[PDB]
Amino acid sequence: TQDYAFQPGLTVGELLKSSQKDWQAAINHRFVKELFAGTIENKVLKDYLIQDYHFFDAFLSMLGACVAHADKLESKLRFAKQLGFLEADEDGYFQKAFKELKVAENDYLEVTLHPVTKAFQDLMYSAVASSDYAHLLVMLVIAEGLYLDWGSKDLALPEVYIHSEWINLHRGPFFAEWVQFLVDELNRVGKNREDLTELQQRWNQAVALELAFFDIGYD
Amino acid sequence: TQDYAFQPGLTVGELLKSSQKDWQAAINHRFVKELFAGTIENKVLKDYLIQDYHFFDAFLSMLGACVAHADKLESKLRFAKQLGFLEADEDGYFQKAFKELKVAENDYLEVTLHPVTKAFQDLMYSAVASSDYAHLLVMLVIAEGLYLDWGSKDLALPEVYIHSEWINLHRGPFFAEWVQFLVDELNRVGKNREDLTELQQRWNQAVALELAFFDIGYD
Secondary structure, eight states, X not given: OOOOSSOOHHHHHHHHHTTXXXXXXXXXXXXXXXXHHTOOOHHHHHHHHHHHHHHHHHHHHHHHHHHHHOSOHHHHHHHHHHHHHIIIIIHHHHHHHHHHTTOOHHHHHTSOOOHHHHHHHHHHHHHHHHTOHHHHHHHHHHHHHHHHHHHTOSSOOOSSHHHHXXXXXXXXXXXXXXXXXXXXXXXXXXXXXXXXXXXXXXXHHHHHXXXXXXTGGGO | OOOOSSOOHHHHHHHHHTTHHHHHHHHTOHHHHHXXXXXXXXXXXXXXXXXXXXXXXHHHXXXXXXXXXXXXXXXXXXXXXXXXXXIIIIHHHHHHHHHHTTOOHXXXXXXXXXXXXXXXXXXXXXXXXXXOHHHHHHHHHXXXXXXXXXXXOSSOOOSSHHXXXXXXXXXXXXXXXXXXXXXXXXHHHHTTOTTHHHHHXXXXXXXXXXXXXXXXXXX
């Protein structure tokens, strides 16, 4: 019944059923509302972005691990394409946002990982350690799929670059096609697996952490 | 004493000493001579490129594993940048070259891996399996460094695209800077390692395989 910005199919559709409350709470979080309105306080966005730049570090590693462990050359190449985009456009955003928000390089070194950020990294690095494409895809479908689901909201875009660009990085046909690729891959490789319970446990925990992460800047 | 297109430094400089004969034989191979002259037979280039597109598959995986296992975010990002380049420009070359040489998708599925190609993949996938950044860098410094060393030769470039573009993909300031990055990284992480013998054994075997690979099209 629940609609999403992507077409979940069978396996991802099944995984989504147990995380619904967390998923909906995340995409309708205060953070998302205030970002779209342009009303979000700089201190809140700054704190979120500092923690998120650590997410991004482990996130690149997951994409790398998919290039390493995907079973199809075409899939490897699509991951490679996304990695090039992230180095150019997403890292570019972070550097511009930190300059605007007056975050020096060391003002990044010195910020402690929030317990949620630490939990998320642990979970991401365990997917890397598994060398298991399905476990990596669980993490990526959630991170990218949930961000597409809020990014795709029918709300007027805010005028300030540091607001609009964070939305635009998680919105639009290129990102939507990428998310559907990830979903299609998890449906492909997830189809007949013995360890669906383990995948579901990872899935549910990662959605919970996505929701908790949005509270970081409001602490 | 031996000059290279990159500055080897300490650790890479030491590794190079035991592979000199193979290295020089590879960069002065008939393949390289005939490619630069534009005299290489289509059948020879085709056979080489078909086997090389399997090298490229495992090669992307090694780059991915470096994004996953590099110890610095800046390094991860440089690997991510190179992966985007390879998906765009290098895969693009392969698709154009196969079209020109009339190699159908299935004329790729059906070609057996040459024993050298198989050996090289095994060695590349073992570096991936190690999750050890130094072992991955050994493989990448050799693959990219040796290709820069022949690609950088002071010989007039041939006129035919399928010849010139294979040279141009392994020549020039962007590729040279990439190779020096890789060397600098191996010098950084290789500096104090207990398993230098194991790294040297990998190194020497990979250079030997690079040399053998050039004979594939002449078999």
